[PDB]
Amino acid sequence: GEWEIIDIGPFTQNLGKFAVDEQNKIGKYGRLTFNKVIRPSMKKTIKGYEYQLYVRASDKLFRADISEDYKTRGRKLLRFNGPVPPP
């Protein structure tokens, strides 16, 4: 596919909420509270999309990679790591 910078509107914020909810199921960083997705957010095409976000949760910053299937709209958290340096 092709990588691009995308906005941080509702769609993108919800991807960040998803990432935190999925992290919380795994419990890797304990139970986090989604704050916000900050810039920059990146998207690639895959049949679907891959998203790489900076996610603020419980006042710390994480990087999350999320995939989304085009036809079903089903999502997967691929990676959730941090804390990371600010962009």
Author numbering: 1 to 46, 56 to 96
Question: Any passages from the paper?
Answer:
Monellin, isolated from the African plant Dioscoreophyllum cumminsii, is, together with thaumatin, one of the most potent sweeteners known, being about 90,000 times sweeter than sucrose on a molar basis. Wild type monellin has a cystatin-like fold, composed of two non-covalently linked chains, which dissociate when heated above ~50 °C. This is accompanied by taste loss and prevents the use of the protein as a sweetener above this temperature. To circumvent this inconvenience, single chain derivatives with higher thermostability, among which MNEI, have been designed. All sweet proteins elicit a taste response upon interaction with the human taste receptor T1R2-T1R3, a heterodimeric G-protein coupled receptor (GPCR) located on specialised cells on the tongue.
